Amino acid sequence: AESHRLYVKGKHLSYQRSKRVNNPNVSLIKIEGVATPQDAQFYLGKRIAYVYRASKEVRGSKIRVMWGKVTRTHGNSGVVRATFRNNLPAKTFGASVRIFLYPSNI
Amino acid sequence: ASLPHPKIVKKHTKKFKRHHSDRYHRVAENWRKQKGIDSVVRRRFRGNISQPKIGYGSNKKTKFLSPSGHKTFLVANVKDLETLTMHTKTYAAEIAHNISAKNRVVILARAKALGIKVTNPKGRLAL
Amino acid sequence: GIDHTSKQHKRSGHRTAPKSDNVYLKLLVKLYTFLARRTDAPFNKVVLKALFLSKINRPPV
Amino acid sequence: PSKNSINRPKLTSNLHHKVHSLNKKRAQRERAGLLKPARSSVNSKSGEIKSVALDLYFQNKKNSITTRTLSKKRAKKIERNLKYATQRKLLV
Amino acid sequence: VEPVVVIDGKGHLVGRLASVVAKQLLNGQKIVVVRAEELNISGEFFRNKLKYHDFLRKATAFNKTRGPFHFRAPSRIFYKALRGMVSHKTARGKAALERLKVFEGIPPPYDKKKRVVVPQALRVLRLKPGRKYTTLGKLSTSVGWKYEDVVAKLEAKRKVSSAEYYAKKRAFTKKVASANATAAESDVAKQLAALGY
Amino acid sequence: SAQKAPKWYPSEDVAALKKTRKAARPQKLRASLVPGTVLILLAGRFRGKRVVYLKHLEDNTLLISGPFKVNGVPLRRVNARYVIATSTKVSVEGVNVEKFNVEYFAKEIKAERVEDQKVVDKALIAEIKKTPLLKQYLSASFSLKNGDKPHMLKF
RNA sequence: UUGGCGGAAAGGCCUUGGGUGCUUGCUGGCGAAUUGCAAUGUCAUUUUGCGUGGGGAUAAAUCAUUUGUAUACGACUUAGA
RNA sequence: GCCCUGAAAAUGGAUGGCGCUCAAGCGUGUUACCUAUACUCUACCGUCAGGGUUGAUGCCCUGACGAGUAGGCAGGCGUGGAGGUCAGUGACGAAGCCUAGACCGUAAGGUCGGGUCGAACGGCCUCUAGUGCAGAUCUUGGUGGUAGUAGCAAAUA
RNA sequence: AAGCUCGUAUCAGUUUUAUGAG
RNA sequence: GGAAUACUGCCAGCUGGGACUGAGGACUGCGACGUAAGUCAAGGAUGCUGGCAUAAUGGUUAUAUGCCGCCCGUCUUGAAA
RNA sequence: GAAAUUGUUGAAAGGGAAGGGCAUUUGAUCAGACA
Ligand SMILES: [Mg+2]
Ligand SMILES: [Mg+2]
Ligand SMILES: [Mg+2]
Ligand SMILES: [Mg+2]
Ligand SMILES: [Mg+2]
Ligand SMILES: [Mg+2]
Ligand SMILES: [Mg+2]
Ligand SMILES: [Mg+2]
Ligand SMILES: [Mg+2]
Ligand SMILES: [Mg+2]
Ligand SMILES: [Mg+2]
Ligand SMILES: [Mg+2]
Ligand SMILES: [Mg+2]
Ligand SMILES: [Mg+2]
């Protein structure tokens, strides 16, 4: 078909932080179409990929991936907490990430 | 091929550098404790450098262990090397810095015959 | 934090070890330490405690 | 963005140009061959002795502007040590 | 959900619109704002003119070219309100502000694009009836903006062309609806109605 | 002597592990994973394709078939956490899947795979033909459209 | 390929005609496998690089010299095949 | 009760800013949510305490604790020389110095590779002291910015 | 910091009871 | 006159999703299910499978991004002041 | 034949200081384990 997407879109908002100190170990993700913590409970445990491009080819590709997963909800507006194998670079505040449908409970 | 050990965990991999050693050439990087009564480093204000303390001490089951799982023992000759002939799975021999290449050849041959690991076998022996 | 009612890291002391470097005195200390641990004899306890005393605290008899 | 032109991106365009320039320069250096080869390559020195003097000696034996030079004292010492190593190889 | 969100600024309250736009830009949404001269500020016209004259009072004493710069255009007033809510001295703040464009009127190519509204910032939904409000174009003209008439004439011409386009679109839509209604009794239509379509 | 020999050396006799109390019990699948159910593949080479679940294997995998005649997916193994189970179900009583197992799928074309594929697909197509548009549904692929919310979708 | 409109930053919108592909509006026949149970698994315009070639056109600025409507120096303003 | 007046100077500026008017103001009520070196659970380090034990100032088990100026106790790192020992290292290169390389220690520091260099030097048990520097408008020596800068314009050429 | 003893020993920035002050 | 429901509290009732942790290293103990031999989630993680086998993970180094970070010593309550 | 300080070459950063800490991206570079 015209579309082959098997993931949900999300935006990397910021790190877990207080007013004057951040925690880069935890990232905050806004998933499109999610507005409540009850709705966000569906996506807990799902895999997240940050997909970006580099000029130097590595292992036969110019596309590089940072993997992580959803851990818990955050706030009252559907934002979720995510943890990655390597922390997101903080230059990606406002960048796009992919939340896949696996592991599946449906 | 070393003794089975738990995973090696380092609590603070970064070097502890002296305050203002980056600022002045006359201040070396060797760690010194700040004795100033008004020192923000001594008083431990937020944003300043970390200081060594006993909480960073490594696990006693993995202390003094190389990434391969051995403890380094300095050797200068065959008699020094043969002290580790039974403790092969725990100790690895390292040739001393002042050993000549001619004696390093003999040490490497003896270690190969005994099955003893050598940390730096390439030293002074480029072909 | 907790509101301590007692001093923290307080040493009991009680003269655990002798201050002398005499090998034979240390051998006697080892022997009577074994005896006091394995006999429950108050005599052994007293002799072991007396083996740790200093010269000014061990007057001649 | 500049206060004299708010509807035109400035920082993002500068970053885009900088990334493109850095990638072009790195690719040109790779094409010129000024970078180390792969670890598993035949010409790799990984895990081996790295010596400017030994590299220059073997290159002169094999037969721009550089700061890598080999002294005659070091060259004679390398020749003497190579004779020692060859004598050991023949004797073993 | 769109790559670019175009907001018709008419009838909006400037502070709430600036708040929502700043949050969207920081989250990484590209936004274009049109018709900034039709924005609204709650409160009376002389109150808002007094506030702008206090802003005009603010200036560096030893060199006026170094001080705060008082931009008179309505889009620039909205941009000031937005920059006050974005931490603009950082690289992230600059990158967020470079995802925003503000315009007076509706210049091309946005005059043929879909334009949306923000309900949480609309005057008719937020302000209580009877409360006074100010028009940003009149405020800007009072404080020194000099292009209200040209914008009005260009907007009138654009409205004439857009009305012609909408008349054609409405005729085509009526034709399409008539062609769709005549197949409502077919078995395919009955199955779609059973399925909810 | 460059370094003094230590007085004490650790013993090199490697100790045995303690007796582990961790018994292996069978996996309990989701209640929506019944044989004959249509599954959507979420990952892998055949991602986004609709297949039919046949048998639960010993290695906690699901045996699935395209069938190969419809969408080109052969008799494969999939992981139960990488599929979406739909409400559509076909009859599987006419299929004999007693041959296939871990030793069957071990990799250390044989054409025994091709023959088994044909034998299974005959009964699979015979059962599929009873439901209108089911063959076209299985040949089509699945993808998310704009505005699709998987937490609100029914499968 | 025919015609019309659009100057706010138009660079876009509508439209005539034939040509050349597809069509899932409906019914069939072949192919898919081993990417081995997942690994973004790479899919979208532009190309200051080259080779092929059919066409299109053959400048100016600065230093130096010179003027003083200019000038601390730069700058400015003049003139010279 | 809320609102207005209920006195104000002097560069341009402040509920922290933007801004906010059925508030993003005031009074009150009900929930949800955010996050401290605090609390709870776990691992690891050290200290203290209580038990066991025929490399025993060692090993094993258990529990609780960890702020700190002057000051007190203890365990360690490093330097010159001395007795002993390793029949220790060294012209197939000692000491020193440089190093985008490597490892071990919480740390003081220790160790290895490469380059340069050319004749002495180290580990351990002890002895000994003119033994560890960022400061003292510290001493001696060396070197920058200032800077191709100020200036080299009295005595007619 | 050292010793001698005691160790249901010695107690306590607290409450209670009885008795005073207000 | 007879029910239901709310509210509050209890269950040594059942059951689905998510995250962090896996210390210890022959056995010994307290238990549970069993007529039984035995088994067990009971004095701390095991089982099955895949890819890679090298700059891939990781370290170092130069920089970028988010947040934090006032110049030390001395002397005076107290010092950015 | 050290340091301060300087020249050349190569890499990098730079919109009214720089330096530091936690974390990661990018470029460069590198050790171990390779049965
Ligand atoms: Mg607020
Ligand atoms: Mg309120
Ligand atoms: Mg504590
Ligand atoms: Mg040397
Ligand atoms: Mg002295
Ligand atoms: Mg000095
Ligand atoms: Mg001092
Ligand atoms: Mg001085
Ligand atoms: Mg001069
Ligand atoms: Mg004169
Ligand atoms: Mg890495
Ligand atoms: Mg700060
Ligand atoms: Mg000389
Ligand atoms: Mg220098």
Helix (H, G, I), strand (E, B) or coil at E26: helix
How far, in Å, is the centroid of ligand 12 from the Cα of B47? 9
Q: List the domain range (segments joined by +) for residue B42.
A: 6-127
Distances (CA, A) of D33 to B77, D27, D28, D36, E181: 43, 10, 9, 8, 71
Q: Phi and psi of F28, rounded to 5°? A: -95, 110
Torsion of CA A50, A51, A55, A58, to 10 degrees: 90
Q: Label the pairing between strands F61-65 and E100-102.
A: unpaired
Q: End-to-end alpha-carbon separation of chain F, Å?
A: 76
Answer for the pair F7, B83: CB distance below 8 angstroms, yes or no. no
Between CA D76 and CA D68 the distance in angstroms is: 17
Residues 6+ apart with CB under 8 A from E25: E31, E86, E96, E97, E99, E100
Answer for the pair E84, E94: CB distance below 8 angstroms, yes or no. no
Contacts of B127 in chain D (CB under 8 A): 85
How far, in Å, is the centroid of ligand 5 from the Cα of B52? 29
Between CA E115 and CA F22 the distance in angstroms is: 63
CATH of residue A98's domain is 2.40.10.190
Nearest CA in chain A to E99: A94
DSSP letter at B9 equals -
Distances (CA, A) of A46 to A93, A101, E195, F86: 20, 6, 32, 19
**B20 within some domain:** yes
Between CA F147 and CA E177 the distance in angstroms is: 25
Q: Please identify residues in chain C, positions 42-61, with a C-beta within 7 angstroms of any atom of strand I.
A: 53-54, 57
- Residue identified by tokens 């050693």 is B21
Q: Phi and psi of F73, rounded to 5°? A: -100, 115
Q: Please identify residues in chain A, positions 74-93, with a C-beta within 7 angstroms of any atom of strand J.
A: 83, 85-86, 89-91, 93
Answer for the pair B33, B43: CB distance below 8 angstroms, yes or no. no
Between CA A8 and CA A48 the distance in angstroms is: 9
Q: Indicate yes or no: strand K within 7 A of the C-beta of D26.
A: yes
Which technique was used to obtain these atomic coordinates? cryo-EM
Q: Indicate yes or no: strand J within 7 A of the C-beta of B39.
A: yes
Residues 6+ apart with CB under 8 A from E105: E34, E35, E37, E151, E154, E155, E158
Sign, Cα dihedral of B58, B64, B66, B69: negative
Chain A interface, Cβ < 8 Å to F: 1, 3-8, 33-34, 39, 42-43, 100-106
Q: How far is the CA of A27 from the C1' of H67 (A)?
A: 33
Which of A3, A4, A102 minimises the CB distance to F82?
A: A102
Strand order in the sheet with F37-41: F76-79, F61-65, F50-56, F37-41, F83-89
**A11, amino acid identity:** K
E strands present in B1-127: 71-75, 91-95
The token duo for F63 is: 């045996």
Domains in chain B, number:
1
Nearest CA in chain D to A55: D23
Between CA F124 and CA F121 the distance in angstroms is: 5
Between CA A46 and CA A80 the distance in angstroms is: 11
Answer for the pair C50, C28: CB distance below 8 angstroms, yes or no. no
Between CA F143 and CA A2 the distance in angstroms is: 9
The last residues before gaps in chain F (C-N over 2.5 Å) are 108
Q: Phi and psi of F7, rounded to 5°? A: -70, -40
Minimal C-alpha gap between F72 and chain A (Å): 17
Answer for the pair D7, E101: CB distance below 8 angstroms, yes or no. yes
Strand K contact nucleotides, protein CB < 7 Å: 3-5, 9, 11-16, 19-34
Domains in chain A, number:
1
Minimal C-alpha gap between F117 and chain A (Å): 27
Strand I contact nucleotides, protein CB < 7 Å: 1-4
- Judged by CB atoms closer than 8 Å, whether chains meet at D81 and B122 is answered as no
Q: List the domain range (segments joined by +) for residue A37.
A: 1-106
Between CA B48 and CA E131 the distance in angstroms is: 54
**B1 within some domain:** no
Q: How far is the CA of B28 from the C1' of K2 (A)?
A: 15
| Spatial CA neighbour of B90 closest among B112, B110, B61 | B61
**Which helix (H) or strand (E) segment is F33 a member of?**
none
CB atoms within 10 A of CB E22: 22
The token duo for F42 is: 């979420």
**F30, amino acid identity:** R
| Spatial CA neighbour of F40 closest among F87, F93, F95 | F87
The token duo for E166 is: 């909408």
How far, in Å, is the centroid of ligand 12 from the Cα of A21? 11
Sign, Cα dihedral of E177, E178, E183, E185: positive
Q: Indicate yes or no: strand I within 7 A of the C-beta of C9.
A: no
